[PDB]
């Protein structure tokens, strides 16, 4: 579609449409496109002494890209509140993408006064690569994603990525891409520019919690028929001789009843308290911090695998880096407190998988014989057995919707570890430039390339509607359900609405289990 | 189906029919239904003061459940023994069930003489759920399913399940299920119930055990193309000086070769041995016991992995928890001696399983110096790596047929650890209930509900046919197999033959592998 | 009996019934350890928000 | 338990006037059951306005 | 409809017309509308001590 400098490119849509089966999301917003790096590449890399495990080397691009990967961006908190409470699951089947209302602006800063006028005859430039043959920056949980809110104006992210490195050095196999060098559509004011995606297969997310636990799956009235050893020795009244002893479990005693499976796998925590006393008083962020080791260089695992993070009363502890951490509106970037900060809490898992603070369980460490006595071992970390069931991470609302499966000879389980959607083949990242245009050559010829360029930005509007999945509830379950309520009594601020100043803001994080199956 | 008063509603079919692909069971017995909790729901919780680990939450119901779920049930031991000698491997593929000359009798206790008599009106009324629906009790091991020899009456087992629990107390996600809240169809006299059912496509059970092992799958004449650390030191005749050399690996030294595969997964278990003397003198039953570690309560894991339970000619030892366990027939529940219980051996895994009592092997501690020896650690647990292969737990005669795999986020291997066949949509329960009949009601009207009944039970036959597919062992090894045998020398007592009582028994569990196929 | 959906544009999150999530002895809307239903609290029918 | 029909008519103090009615409910049609009969009937809502 | 730059998207009809049964009354105004609450949402509520 090319219409006239006159003509407007494209309606506004922001929408939710409920056929029953499908959600259909629709959301618009407007962008604001600088140029970045003065339309040159660069390379970057580790300042000076950084330490070992903070070195990189990388390129930083005069693209930028746009990101709708959180899911803030397509529901809105009654939205959300209607799939959260009235279904099991959700996934992902085709999204569309639309952008409308281009225009191209020169800035001219002389003395203190700056006058923006429209450039008509500037172009910006857009290709969706869609084959893949870039470093795929989405899925880290960077800033920069569409607003939650629609009223609001957002600044387009620059792009960059990382390769291999020696210290800050770069290694012979490094790969440089030059985003020049690919087919992409020109746009002027007048055009427009569009692509539809259709999601693979994926396993819905399950936004439900269990009523039962592995531990107890068992009618309570009946005994076995299985034996087990209930004790190991009888007296004689003088002393107590070695005698073993069998028993069939029943109520009296469950923990002895034979079970068919085993809860999820563990990686271990250190556990922090949200009350400043309980916790002890050292450095201990990074040296008691639980790492992986890549390379000679440690790595912090943030993510950590999906565990619940405190057991029964504990809701004061939560693991030291096993949760997802989200700032509340108005935080800034480096030492915050805790009252800033909101964390997230997994404990729906308790059931099918381990507390994160604490080990998986016990392990017996020697043979036994009349002379020795038996000992015991903690497993502090537990692999994948035969037989082992576990619930994966909650998206939550603001959480990340999807991430790549990295192309590999082989992988476990592709479910992400920060929660969503592992695509092999994700939604394809659109890259977005402002065209250079040159100011006043010299009339004498000169081979060298040009350090002048005309100041200039452009903006319009972005479109993106996704459609959902639903997984329908059906259960005979008698009494009511848990539900998300905003809370009934009086406040100075409605939560999720904007306040006097006019700044939106988001006073919890909301994940997506309530509805309770059983396991 | 709807007969008369005189009318049989069905036949009795007790039957093994073998079309030499399939092989089709049918058993039919007699069994009494009282009537529980006075008709009415109850919630039993963990009793006072019992420990941490013993806490339950739960529900008790007036319905009755059957349960088949034991091989025993389907299969005589000769039945059984054209299966097991014959075949590689089995698996279920379609069943059904059937109800039939039910009747209801009422009984009057009037000072010490009880008349009991046909009550020809009252109904008896049952469903399947197969939108698995409730709390899925069977697979967990309980006693109740019908009885190994047909001529004997069982009563049918009440039905209860657990829910989420606080120490005793309830949370707001457990679930209460009312049963009387489906669609049930209710049975007079002269009617009868019927369902058939198709099992999922699922894995053959491996009834072969291996003529090889993981350890020894190579060619003993030829030597092979890549070297190993034969020695890493050479004498200089004052002192050994440090050089490292290499060989290729040869008929001489065996366990040096580049092997190709590795051994499955273990969690160690304590050893404990058959002989009292032996055993260490303490209690370490529970403290000396391997556990896993949920929610802050621990639990015993009785079925353990599957491992092979002893070494060559260790048969005396066998694991802490790590086997099946089952009584002896007229076994009493509690603190009962050695003699009584039947333990089974696992020994027929020992060429691809580790030995459940030790470790999988040794690790580096350390990294070598000149100045500092090279050390190393044992690893008494170890998760799945890639390459491992595993043998899954034998089946045996009494033990469960199958379990149903959590629903759940992500599983691995779903195999059960009891044994047997892993269903994502197992078997539907089949519950049933007594219709209450009131007794004289007032003749004054009252709101309350009504605390007198008619007393009366139930009685009828419930016929079981299932239809299992065979994998036939073709083979070229030149001498004979191992076979199950009776035993050719005189007796008092055939074994599995009721006594001069009139009491059946089963002298020994009957596992699954004999057969031998080469790995 | 025919329902008459809920379609809003509402931007923040209604009002729900829900179940308390603390611990108690008893679960509301279930039978106790004597078998006896009961009901905690009246129920009405008006959560849902329409403007005027 | 299935509760006992009764009604109330026209009175002065306790006593009857002469408008209040009396009804027999021996005297209309009525199905008689015995085990092994049932009894049905269907119903159709006139038109009613939602509950809000 | 979409025009172009110096097309004239639609005419003045400034009009009343009588059929007798009916009268269609039309009227065309020039509206001027600002940009308020710089482009944002905010709350409002009663001042103080009101």
């Known amino acids: 579609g090319a219409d006239g400098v006159g003509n407007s490119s494209g309606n506004w849509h922001c929408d939710s449409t409920w056929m029953g089966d499908r959600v259909i999301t629709t959301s618009t917003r407007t962008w604001a496109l600088p140029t970045y790096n003065n339309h040159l590449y660069k390379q970057i890399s580790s300042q000076s002494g950084a330490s070992n495990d903070n070195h990189y080397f990388g390129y930083s691009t005069p693209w930028g890209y746009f990101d709708f990967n959180r899911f803030h961006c397509h529901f809105s908190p009654r939205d959300w509140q209607r799939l959260i409470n009235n279904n099991w ?3 992902p089947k085709r999204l569309n993408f639309k952008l409308f209302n281009i225009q191209v602006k020169e800035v001219t800063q002389n003395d203190g006064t ?66 020049e060098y690919f087919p992409s559509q020109m746009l002027r004011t007048g055009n427009n520019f569009t692509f539809s995606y259709t999601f693979e297969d994926v396993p819905f997310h399950s936004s439900y919690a269990h009523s039962q636990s592995l531990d107890r799956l068992m009618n309570p009235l009946i005994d076995q028929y299985l034996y087990y050893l209930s004790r190991t020795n009888t007296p004689s009244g003088t002393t107590t001789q070695s005698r073993l002893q069998f028993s069939q479990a029943g109520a009296s005693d469950i923990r002895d009843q034979s079970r068919n499976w085993l809860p999820g796998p563990c990686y271990r925590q250190q556990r922090v308290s949200k009350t400043s006393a309980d916790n002890n008083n050292s450095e201990y962020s990074w040296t008691g911090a639980t790492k992986y080791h890549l390379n000679g260089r440690d790595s912090l695992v943030n993510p950590g695998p999906a565990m619940a993070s405190h057991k029964d009363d504990e809701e004061k502890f939560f693991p030291q880096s096993g949760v997802l951490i989200f700032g509340k509106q108005g935080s800034e970037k480096t030492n915050v407190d805790i009252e800033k900060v909101m964390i997230t809490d997994e404990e729906e898992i308790r059931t099918t998988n381990p507390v994160a603070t604490e080990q998986y369980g016990s392990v017996s460490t020697n043979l036994q014989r009349g002379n020795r006595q038996a000992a015991t071992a903690d497993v502090n970390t537990q692999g994948v057995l035969p037989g082992m069931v576990w619930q994966d991470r909650d998206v939550y609302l603001q959480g990340p919707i999807w991430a790549k499966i990295p192309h590999t000879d082989g992988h476990f389980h592709p479910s992400p570890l920060m929660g969503g959607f592992g695509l092999k083949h994700p939604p394809p990242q659109i890259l977005i430039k402002n065209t250079p245009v040159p100011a006043n050559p010299s009339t004498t010829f000169s081979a060298a390339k040009f350090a002048s360029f005309i100041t200039q930005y452009s903006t319009g509007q972005v479109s993106v509607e996704i459609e959902w999945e639903l997984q329908k509830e059906n259960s005979k379950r008698w009494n009511p359900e848990i539900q998300y309520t905003s809370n009934y009594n009086k406040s100075v601020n409605v939560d999720f609405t904007v306040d006097t100043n006019g700044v939106y803001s988001e006073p919890r994080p909301i994940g997506t289990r309530y509805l309770t199956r059983n396991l």
Chains 1, 2 share one sequence.
């Open 89 to 91: 699951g959700f996934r």
């Open 114 to 179: 700056t006058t923006i006028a429209n450039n008509l005859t500037s172009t910006v430039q857009v290709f969706t690569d869609s084959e893949y043959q870039l470093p795929y920056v989405l899925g880290s949980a960077h800033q920069g994603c569409l607003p939650p809110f629609p009223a609001d104006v957002f600044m387009v992210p620059q792009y960059g990525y990382l390769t291999l490195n020696n210290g800050s050095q770069a290694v012979g196999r490094s790969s440089f891409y030059c985003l």
